[PDB]
Amino acid sequence: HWGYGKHNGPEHWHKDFPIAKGERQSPVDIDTHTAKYDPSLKPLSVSYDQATSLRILNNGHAFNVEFDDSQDKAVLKGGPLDGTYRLIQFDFHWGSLDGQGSEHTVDKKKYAAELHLVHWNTKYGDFGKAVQQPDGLAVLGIFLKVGSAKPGLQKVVDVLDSIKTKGKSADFTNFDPRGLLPESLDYWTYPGSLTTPPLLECVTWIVLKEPISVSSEQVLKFRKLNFNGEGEPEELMVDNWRPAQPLKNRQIKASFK
């Protein structure tokens, strides 16, 4: 099955998922000089006050924090979006070394990691119907750099010891994802895909310009997770990023002058 190694990683994925070589694949390099300010962008609204997390899972690729999305709670709207999109999960991608780890890049610069807050368009009723639609998802992407600690990340870091291997999961309630957001909501936006198989082309990407800082100790704990399941040879969970894909016929729009 797919992964991030030599024989099953991103260069192989097109075999089982031919959309890998599609017209609106993610991530991409954000050329900041080529991105155009768009004054028609409405203000971005991130309303996470009533977010309710359910659990955290190691899926053998990364860890997912999954939210109860049964009520109208944790909504992203505005900016490039029409209508309302509801938070269902967040996930990270990171490196073996601080010099790499992010999926999107900014003028070719790789950040130490990247966080994705995944939301579905409530016009489509649930996540599974939404991913069948070209406007079904909005992913808020946030870069992480190594420096000062992020206090609001520490609850995630501490729970990782309990989900070390593939297939392990834990309850994970009352996690507030507002504690993972930088000060500025300045962003770039473009139409793209999920960055893991099945690579579906359903996503409006909204990538924040301002990174959050996390400490070296916090990201070292991410690197202690395992790809393998319990009782197979230990392969550390690192470098679970897909590299930048061709931009094709797309334009990246900036929300800021």
Which residues are marked as active site? 61
Question: Where on the chain is the footprint of Zn ion (CB under 5 A)?
Answer: 91, 116
Residues 6+ apart with CB under 8 A from 46: 76, 140, 181, 185
Query: Shortest approach of Zn ion to residue 139 CB, angstroms?
Result: 7
Measured distance CA(46)–CA(77) in Å, rounded: 7
Cis peptide before 151 (omega within 30 of 0): no
Q: How far is the CB of 39 from Zn ion (least distance, A)?
A: 30
Quickly tell me which residue has 């992964």 as its tokens: 3
Q: Cβ 58 to Zn ion, closest distance in Å?
A: 14
Cβ distance to Zn ion smaller for residue 38 or 239: 239
Minimal CB distance to Zn ion: which residue?
A: 116
Strands in 22-84 per DSSP E: 29-30, 36-37, 44-47, 53-58, 63-67, 75-78
Which CB atom, from 35 or from 65, has the smaller least distance to Zn ion? 65
Quick one: 179 or 197, whose CB is closer to Zn ion?
A: 197
Residue with tokens 């507030």: 176
User: What is the rounded CA–CA span in Å between residue 104 and residue 212?
Assistant: 15
Between CA 83 and CA 80 the distance in angstroms is: 10
Give min distance, CB of 89 to Zn ion, in A.
9
Q: Given the complex with Zn ion, which of 225 and 231 has the nearer CB atom?
A: 225
Cα Rg, the chain, nearest whole Å: 17
Cβ distance to Zn ion smaller for residue 86 or 116: 116
CB of 108 to Zn ion, least distance (A): 20
Backbone φ and ψ for 180, nearest 5 degrees, come out as -105, 5
